[PDB]
Amino acid sequence: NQPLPRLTVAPTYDSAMSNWISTTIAFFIRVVNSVNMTATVNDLTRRTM
């Protein structure tokens, strides 16, 4: 938790929430570019993901 800000806010990419979305979305990007995935699932489609 952080103290309420009395200025102007702009979606920041720091913070547990934000980081949690960034590392986890970084994990499933690894699940998609992994051995298993890479051999089965098509190629160009796997890029789209």
Binding site: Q2, P3, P5, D14, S22, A26
Partner: protein, 216 residues
């Protein structure tokens, strides 16, 4: 005697005096940072492999130990190669930012503030605006080291350095950063203690004892 599984030898022996806390002058801080090799001066590879310039873990000192990396640095860690390079760069490029706001020649004989200097440098690495920290990068030994952080300003917003009237909530340092290729698996790697992590602690600095009760 023995406490649980640990056995304690009879003789009691402790240091008998304490060195008066000495605050680093502004010039020394400037040389420590702008030295040929930062290794030893600032950071120090705990187990640097001779064969190849590789280090599993690196224990760090003062103006660096304060710093706590942002997510992008943890994920995809660097090798002891670009690590020395990263710092040998940023340590220098930081001295710039800080020295252009305080020309050394005129004000070098002024003690930097242990605390702010830490957050001011750690925030610089994470690439966060360092404007605010500079305002009070110094402090007269008479005013408490943690007091100048409050007296100068009760700024409760800057993430990782919330200064209230009596306390300064900052994220503990990281006495250990782990360069890519580190694993707590091997019994050989130096005991990092989890500090290789960014947020494992939360150092709350307090001004007075009543200020501390209110904290606890």
């Amino acid at each position: 005697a023995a406490v649980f599984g640990i056995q304690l030898v009879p003789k009691l022996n402790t240091s008998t005096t304490r060195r008066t806390f000495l605050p680093l002058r502004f010039d020394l801080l400037l040389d420590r940072l702008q030295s040929t090799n930062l290794h030893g001066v600032l950071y120090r590879a705990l187990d640097f492999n001779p064969v190849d310039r590789s280090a599993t873990v690196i224990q760090t000192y003062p103006p660096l130990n304060a710093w706590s990396p942002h997510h992008a640095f943890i994920e995809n860690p660097l090798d002891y190669r670009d690590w020395t390079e990263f710092i040998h760069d940023r340590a220098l490029a930081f001295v710039g930012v800080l020295t252009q706001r305080y020309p050394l020649t005129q004000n070098a004989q002024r003690y930097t503030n242990p605390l702010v200097l830490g957050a001011a440098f750690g925030d610089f690495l994470n690439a966060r605006s360092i404007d605010i920290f500079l305002d009070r990068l110094f402090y007269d030994p008479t005013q408490d080291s943690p007091i100048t952080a409050i007296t100068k300003f009760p700024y409760q917003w800057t993430i990782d350095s919330n200064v209230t009237t009596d306390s300064v909530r900052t994220s503990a340092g990281c006495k250990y950063i782990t360069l890519y290729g580190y694993d707590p698996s091997r019994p050989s790697t130096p005991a990092t203690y989890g500090k290789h992590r960014p947020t494992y602690a939360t150092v709350f600095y307090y001004s007075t004892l009543p200020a501390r009760s209110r904290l606890l």
